[PDB]
Amino acid sequence: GARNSVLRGKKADELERIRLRPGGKKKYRLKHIVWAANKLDRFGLAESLLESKEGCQKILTVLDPMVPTGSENLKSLFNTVCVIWCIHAEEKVKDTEGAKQIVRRHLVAETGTAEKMPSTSRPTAPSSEKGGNY
Numbered sequence: 001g002a003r004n005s006v007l008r009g010k011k012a013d014e015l016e017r018i019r020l021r022p023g024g025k026k027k028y029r030l031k032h033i034v035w036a037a038n039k040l041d042r043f044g045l046a047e048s049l050l051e052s053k054e055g056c057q058k059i060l061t062v063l064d065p066m067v068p069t070g071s072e073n074l075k076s077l078f079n080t081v082c083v084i085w086c087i088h089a090e091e092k093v094k095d096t097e098g099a100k101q102i103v104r105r106h107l108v109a110e111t112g113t114a115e116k117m118p119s120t121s122r123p124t125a126p127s128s129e130k131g132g133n134y
Ligand SMILES: CCCC(=O)OC[C@H](COP(=O)(O)O[C@@H]1[C@H](O)[C@H](O)[C@@H](OP(=O)(O)O)[C@H](OP(=O)(O)O)[C@H]1O)OC(=O)CCC
Pocket: 020, 021, 024, 026, 032, 035, 036, 072, 073, 075, 076, 077, 079, 080, 096
């Protein structure tokens, strides 16, 4: 675009506040948007799809399964697309991880009300398995 750019004023704050990592010091910036939008065009996806939250949902759905079966060059874009959606859905996130959760919870909710119910689970092991911070 061009008219007052794409990013807003009040929104630019929260956007510039979000950090790429939970324990890092890097914050999202136009630089990351260019690297992301540039990937879509090349891959085959459009760029305007990053403007509408609805379009972003069609992207995360494809990159979703690409995470557990793809390279880092892809997972990187998947992390950004998750944040772009949180910006248009008025969703607030502290870091990139938080955005990945909120978005996911919103997708599984739509892809879990037709015929994709969860299966039986298993109890924890007797051995020592207590290691993890909040
Ligand atoms: C010329 C090659 C360099 C290049 O292209 O640069 C890649 C660009 C910016 O550079 P970077 O800060 O090194 O990249 C990110 C940080 O190291 C972050 O700490 C790491 O952790 P997490 O966020 O995953 O926890 C990210 O991992 P993946 O998401 O890739 O696994 C990594 O991408 O990545 C972006 O941020 C773009 C938007 C996602």
